[PDB]
Amino acid sequence: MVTIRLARHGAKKRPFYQVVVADSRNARNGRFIERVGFFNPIASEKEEGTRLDLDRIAHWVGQGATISDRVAALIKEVNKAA
Amino acid sequence: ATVNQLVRKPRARKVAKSNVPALEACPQKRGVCTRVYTTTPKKPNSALRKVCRVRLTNGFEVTSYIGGEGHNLQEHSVILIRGGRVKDLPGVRYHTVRGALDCSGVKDRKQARSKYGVKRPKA
Amino acid sequence: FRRIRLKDPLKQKQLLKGLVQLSEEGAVQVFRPISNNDLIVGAVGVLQFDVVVARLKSEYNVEAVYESVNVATARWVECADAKKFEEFKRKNESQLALDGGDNLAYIATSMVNLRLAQERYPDVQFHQTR
Amino acid sequence: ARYLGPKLKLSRREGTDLFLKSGVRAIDTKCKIEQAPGQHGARKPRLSDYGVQLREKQKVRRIYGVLERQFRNYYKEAARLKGNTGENLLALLEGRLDNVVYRMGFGATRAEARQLVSHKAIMVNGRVVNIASYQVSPNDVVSIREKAKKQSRVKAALELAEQREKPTWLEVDAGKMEGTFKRKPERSDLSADINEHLIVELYSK
Amino acid sequence: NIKSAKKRAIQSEKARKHNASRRSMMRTFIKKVYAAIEAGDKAAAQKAFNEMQPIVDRQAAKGLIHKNKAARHKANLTAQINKLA
RNA sequence: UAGCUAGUAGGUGGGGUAACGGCUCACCUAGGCGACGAUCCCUAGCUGGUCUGAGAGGAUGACCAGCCACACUGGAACUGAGACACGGUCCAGACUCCUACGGGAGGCAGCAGUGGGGAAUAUUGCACAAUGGGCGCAAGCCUGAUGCAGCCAUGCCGCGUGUAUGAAGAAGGCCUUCGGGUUGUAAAGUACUUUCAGCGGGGAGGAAGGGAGUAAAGUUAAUACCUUUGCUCAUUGACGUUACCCGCAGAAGAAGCACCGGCUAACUCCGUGCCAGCAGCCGCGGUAAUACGGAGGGUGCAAGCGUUAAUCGGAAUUACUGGG
């Protein structure tokens, strides 16, 4: 089963997640098909806080990927009319 | 030159042996340390150098040079062995670590005290 | 009472650890002199056959048969307040002895040395540890 | 980290004035300069190539207050930049925060400037920095916060700033102690005496 | 080892007879057709093939056979019974 | 290590595998590999990568990540889509334990922790607060993965151990041609400051969600149920006596280690006397030791400093770049 999920990179007390498409049986930092965008939870207001390419995400939705709760919250953050 | 000879038989790098056969690259070894006696050196020295034949814990029979001024060794008192040739005693390729196990440090030393294991002058 | 002189001197670490395990107890308090040999077993009783039988365990393999060596009176434990016990360590630096729990009593060979120690005036926030 | 010792013996050792003991007072002549680095100052050394390279390195290090590993890191940051290595190394040494505070006149000596940076007084772009290893970016503004402004230690030491060259690449306001950083310094502007070529030849091996 | 989920062991014991017993009767029907191959009677071979076909397809339906083993049986056994006839 | 192979090499036919397949059996031929290293012995998890090196190369691949193999040893099958299976089954062997002695229990190369080995390596800690995995519609449950906490200067980085002023150029130590110099603005004294520790108070962020209630749009016969979105309330932190900020007091609690003949940064005096001893190489010590030991001073690094062990460079002393 494919899924779109965060990967938990960064340092101790310095999180930096990687939204990525991967199988559920693989590891969190393990093998992935391809990466699309990123998220930084400590990215308070500066030049860039979140990049997220919606084309490949819509392509993986067209394939059957299960979106997790944080990635769905990022989809509701990157709104089509906002 | 003559590259076809290198095609048949490649240029084999010499594997030089180590100066201290210390069983797969370890810093120190711990031995039984018997046979405490003095050894007169080679020709331009004319001295009496203290030495000990150290039966190591891996089966090897090495002989390490006893450094420092005075020691408490008598056929016993397990010590620590470090590498390095002595260039004064042929057959001796090792040194004794002072401040280590049972051989105590050198009495009344102030300068060069990390080597030979002497503490800081307390007074 | 007497000493530790470590017959079969291989692997001292079972007594450098396992008797320090017994040094926190009320019966046994191990005393370490500076010269790194001749470690004193503390006994408040007389029969030290308890520790000698206890030296035949899974992590206890050294014998240390006893003899007669005279060290007299109890090593009165004292750790004085700062800036003042430093020169007390400095003047007789060959006359200290580590204890079980990193203490330094004075050294006890006779009553006259304890009288000289009381003459030396070690003002102390006193704790007995006994 | 810091030397915190005989900062006057070092200028006698190098011979040139390292500006460690600058102070409110002028050129002292109170330590018998150029003729007594120590006990055996009457000896004339052989002074070889590695000797003059090491003396030049120690001279630049005790001018700028940088330790050996940190200066090797500055050389690694100098060899990677554009232009040439020797100009880049002195630009990186000038880009230290304490050197900028020293050129502004906010403190008599360099150690006093380092202490002024360290004890929560020097603030650049509204962000306080205590460690002197901050790489000063171009087009910044350095000042002193209001809770640490003019407790006389900046004041009389500013008068020494009236006796210095007052270089071109930085401007001080001198009414509210608000400096202004500008473009990077040219090689033909900073002190005109120190030799980067011996440092390059030393760290090339 | 002591485990709360040891039920999957003995239930597989509950499997290892029954499903295999079905497999057992399956292959015996197949072997019956081989008896017709040793008999030479094409009518008995056709009757045995018609007897073994729906039960081996039912065994292919219940997850025991991946409907390519039993397909191979139907293929080569049909080839034998129309080569003999 | 110069011959190896007999299910061996290939073909036909039967069976078997989720599937080609000597994968497995019946028949036929004598083929197949090999000096461009077949078979045999030793060693070794492989790789992205790490270190060094201008590059080419050399060792390594420990931590992060992918694959493979293993679960006290060997073998075997079942369930299951996926195991011929770490915390599943059986059999045979070794080792601990119980027995009422008829018979059974066990496999830390999991997290912790222990014996032994070794020079060498940690706590029998907190919680699902967040991520992920399993089940459930959901709420909720488990998670020694994880998020952390404790120890170890093991490695890197930063800060401090005061700053300015201060000559009688004090006392003491060392040297001396006993004139004086050195330690030395160093210390004492005076004026400020308290970074970091101690104490007392505020205090984020890692927090998204989930629960209850209300409104609107879908759905439907249905303003009932259910999905979704605004909106109201009570809220969810092991870290945590948190990061960070303010206040109290007092320079107050905080500096060692190597070297000093050359290589390579730095000099004298005293004590032995080819004895004690140092040493990485040239080497010193035989009664005037800049090389041993002690005193003073200087140099270098710095909460680290020396020694030992390993890799690379220098070493073009493995020369493919680049030797004879």
Swiss-Prot record, chain A:
GO biological process: cytoplasmic translation; ribosomal small subunit assembly
Alphabetized UniProt keyword annotations: Endonuclease, Hydrolase, Nuclease, Ribonucleoprotein, Ribosomal protein
Disulfide feature: none
InterPro entries for the chain: Ribosomal_bS16, Ribosomal_bS16_CS, Ribosomal_bS16_dom_sf
Pfam families, per database record: Ribosomal_S16
GO cellular component annotations of the record: cytoplasm; cytosolic small ribosomal subunit; small ribosomal subunit
Subunit structure: Part of the 30S ribosomal subunit.
NCBIfam families: S16
Protein name: Small ribosomal subunit protein bS16
Lineage: Bacteria, Pseudomonadati, Pseudomonadota, Gammaproteobacteria, Enterobacterales
UniProtKB/Swiss-Prot annotation, chain C:
Superkingdom as given in the UniProt entry: Bacteria
Sorted UniProt keywords: Cytoplasm, GTP-binding, Nucleotide-binding, Protein biosynthesis
GO annotations of cellular component type: cytosol
One GO process term, biological-process aspect: maintenance of translational fidelity
UniProt subcellular location: Cytoplasm
GO MF annotations, alphabetized: GDP binding; GTP binding; GTPase activity; guanosine tetraphosphate binding; translation release factor activity, codon nonspecific; translation release factor activity, codon specific
Function as written in the Swiss-Prot or TrEMBL entry: Increases the formation of ribosomal termination complexes and stimulates activities of RF-1 and RF-2. It binds guanine nucleotides and has strong preference for UGA stop codons. It may interact directly with the ribosome. The stimulation of RF-1 and RF-2 is significantly reduced by GTP and GDP, but not by GMP.
Family recorded in the similarity comment: Belongs to the TRAFAC class translation factor GTPase superfamily. Classic translation factor GTPase family. PrfC subfamily.
Name assigned to this protein: Peptide chain release factor RF3
Lineage: Bacteria, Pseudomonadati, Pseudomonadota, Gammaproteobacteria, Enterobacterales
Gene: prfC
Residue range from the parent sequence: 398 to 527 of 529
UniProtKB/Swiss-Prot annotation, chain D:
Top-rank taxon, per record: Bacteria
Keywords: Antibiotic resistance, Repressor, Ribonucleoprotein, Ribosomal protein, Ribosome biogenesis, RNA-binding, rRNA-binding, Transcription, Transcription antitermination, Transcription regulation, Transcription termination, Translation regulation
Keyword Magnesium: no
SUPFAM superfamilies (alphabetical): Alpha-L RNA-binding motif (SSF55174)
Annotated S4 RNA-binding domain residues: 95-155
A single Gene Ontology CC term: cytosol
Pfam families xref list: Ribosomal_S4, S4
GO terms under biological process: cytoplasmic translation; DNA-templated transcription termination; maintenance of translational fidelity; negative regulation of translational initiation; response to antibiotic; ribosomal small subunit assembly; ribosomal small subunit biogenesis; transcription antitermination
GO MF annotations in UniProt: mRNA 5'-UTR binding; mRNA regulatory element binding translation repressor activity; rRNA binding; structural constituent of ribosome
Subunit structure: Part of the 30S ribosomal subunit. Contacts protein S5. With proteins S3 and S5 encircles the mRNA as it enters the ribosome, which may play a role in mRNA helicase processivity. Some nascent polypeptide chains are able to cross-link to this protein in situ. The rRNA transcription and antitermination complex (rrnTAC) consists of RNAP, NusA, NusB, NusE (rpsJ), NusG, SubB, ribosomal protein S4, DNA and precursor rRNA; S4 is more flexible than other subunits.
PANTHER family with a match to the protein in the record: 30S 40S RIBOSOMAL PROTEIN, SMALL RIBOSOMAL SUBUNIT PROTEIN US4M
From Swiss-Prot, chain E:
One term under GO cellular component: cytoplasm
Gene Ontology terms describing biological process: cytoplasmic translation; ribosomal small subunit assembly
Segments for region (Disordered): 1-24
Pfam families for the chain: Ribosomal_S20p
GO MF assignments: ornithine decarboxylase inhibitor activity; small ribosomal subunit rRNA binding; structural constituent of ribosome
Presence of the UniProt keyword RNA-binding in the record: yes
Entry keyword RNA-binding: yes
Disulfide partners: none
Keyword annotations: Ribonucleoprotein, Ribosomal protein, RNA-binding, rRNA-binding
Subunit record text: Part of the 30S ribosomal subunit.
Protein purpose: Binds directly to 16S ribosomal RNA.
Family per similarity comment: Belongs to the bacterial ribosomal protein bS20 family.
HAMAP family (UniProt xref): Ribosomal_bS20
Protein name: Small ribosomal subunit protein bS20
Source organism (scientific name): Escherichia coli (strain K12)
Upper taxonomic lineage: Bacteria, Pseudomonadati, Pseudomonadota, Gammaproteobacteria, Enterobacterales
Gene: rpsT
